[PDB]
Write a protein that binds this ligand. Structure first.
Ligand SMILES: O=C(O)c1cccc(CNCCCO/N=C/c2cc(=O)[nH]c(=O)[nH]2)c1
Length: 222
């Protein structure tokens, strides 16, 4: 019901593996005793926005937002009327200088990017309310590794945006000739001035996409 068919076709090889069944049991048990984000129907939103064949750009995240109403299955995104968190505000700030006509959309919902084939993938897909990293190393990492590996092996000329050391390690094995990799600091306030501000990843992405024979992302389409 909640897992997009084209993604299911290519990823379902994971589902019967011991780690996956165990993971499913862990999350189900957590939901019985705690509030877990995102809601069940939004754990796999990243599979719902575009066909797997139509992925053009991959932005790798770590943990889902752990505050009420924030996480909805796309890394960095928050649905209306939730205010964009500090990392997202910094993303928008960089966009405002990198993409000339980009102006703050007045909301944090990145669905418009996802629909264009910008994959917004967290490494860990659930979290206990108010407890950052609470579902770390429970099986999600292996599953999302499987996703990244599939894209690496089966797609062509993808642009991977790797922000922060965690994302960079996750993307370390990507074929740098088949795909394009851009790396910089995490857009969090604590690290944003260590490279993210002035990285110009968004304009650069579109240049690389043209070199891959592909039409650019409209970063304003939100
Ligand atoms: O907002 C401010 O004023 C502010 C000030 C100082 C420092 C920071 C911290 N800057 C890193 C923020 C990182 O944000 N994390 C978002 C995230 C969401 C997600 O779904 N997956 C992630 O991996 N990461 C923010």
């Amino acid at each position: 019901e909640f897992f997009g068919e084209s993604w299911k076709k290519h990823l379902s090889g994971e589902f019967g593996k011991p780690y996956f069944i165990k993971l499913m049991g862990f999350v189900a048990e957590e939901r019985k005793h705690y509030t877990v984000y995102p809601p069940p129907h939004q754990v796999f939103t990243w599979t719902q926005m575009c066909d797997i064949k139509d992925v053009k750009v991959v932005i790798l995240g770590q943990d889902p937002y752990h505050g009420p109403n924030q996480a909805h299955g796309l890394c960095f995104s928050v649905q209306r009327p939730v205010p964009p968190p500090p990392s997202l505000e910094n993303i928008y700030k960089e966009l405002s200088t990198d993409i000339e006509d980009f102006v703050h959309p007045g909301h944090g919902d990145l669905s418009g990017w996802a629909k264009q084939g910008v994959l917004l993938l967290n490494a860990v897909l659930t979290v206990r309310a108010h407890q950052a990293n609470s579902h770390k190393e429970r099986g999600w990492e292996q599953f999302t590794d499987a996703v990244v590996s599939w894209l690496n092996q089966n797609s062509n000329g993808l642009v991977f945006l790797l922000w922060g050391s965690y994302a960079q390690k996750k993307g370390s094995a990507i074929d740098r000739k088949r795909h394009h990799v851009l790396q910089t600091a995490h857009p969090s306030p604590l690290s944003v001035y260590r490279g993210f501000f002035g990285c110009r990843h968004f304009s650069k992405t579109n240049e690389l996409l043209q070199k891959s024979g592909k039409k650019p992302i409209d970063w304003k389409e939100l």
